[PDB]
């Protein structure tokens, strides 16, 4: 697990660690230490009810494109880890969430 730094006050895009073998419907969840994680994006297209538009994802149009998660600058909520959950036809069910990505902000 290697966290990626995010520019202060600027939106940053994180690419999913694992690679899809077909048409993909990713699931994004932002883990919260000591609290309930909040889901960010489902089907890589639309935000769940009650979730701000700050989180957006690439469409699955065509093949040869990698899903990404958008975040709004840096904050306490952004600092906590979030996961990319790949669902591709060939692999099947995705039992493991995968490697974690964390935001770090200082100064």
């Amino acid at each position: 697990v290697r966290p990626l730094s995010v520019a202060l006050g600027e939106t940053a895009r994180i690419s999913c660690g694992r690679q899809a073998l077909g048409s993909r419907a990713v699931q994004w969840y932002q883990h919260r230490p000591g609290q309930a994680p909040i889901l960010l994006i489902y089907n890589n297209q639309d935000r769940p009810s009650g979730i701000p538009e700050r989180f957006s994802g690439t469409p699955d149009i065509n093949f040869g494109t990698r899903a990404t998660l958008t975040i709004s600058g840096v904050e306490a909520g952004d600092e906590a880890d979030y996961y990319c959950h790949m669902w591709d036809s060939r692999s099947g069910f995705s039992w493991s969430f995968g490697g974690a990505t964390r935001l770090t902000v200082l100064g």
Partner: protein
């Protein structure tokens, strides 16, 4: 609104049956597929096998079907029974709801739909250690 509270034993004797359960408030019991999350310290978010609303439980092959889950109709609770536990497996448990969605990439008649679950509600978390 679902006030997701998990019953936490806190201490469980190794190689003994476990009762780690999450309560659900003010929600339909069979509205969503029921799933559980267990995260070991110093590890990525790990999802253990979920149970359908039809009382059929998917099982993680790593767990070797040690976990047995049966949702209690009266108590609005997902009772988990874990047998032959070890200090390694015991960790924080999360209760979650999964919305089944199907993605179709071709002819449905042949069969090209795969079901993907979305974690609408996540667990508050209960930490259990061996005693």
């Amino acid at each position: 609104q679902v006030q997701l509270q998990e019953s936490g034993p806190g201490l469980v004797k190794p190689s003994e049956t476990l009762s780690v359960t999450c309560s659900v408030s003010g929600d339909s019991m069979n509205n969503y597929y029921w799933t559980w999350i267990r995260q070991s310290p110093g590890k990525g978010l790990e999802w253990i096998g979920y149970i359908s609303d039809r009382e059929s439980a998917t099982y993680n092959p790593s767990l070797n079907s040690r976990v047995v889950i049966s949702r209690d109709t009266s108590k609005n609770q997902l009772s988990l029974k874990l047998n032959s536990v070890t200090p390694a497996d015991t960790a924080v448990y999360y209760c979650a709801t999964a919305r089944r969605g199907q993605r179709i990439y071709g002819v449905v008649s042949f069969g090209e739909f795969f079901y993907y679950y979305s974690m609408d509600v996540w667990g508050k978390g209960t930490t259990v250690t061996v005693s």
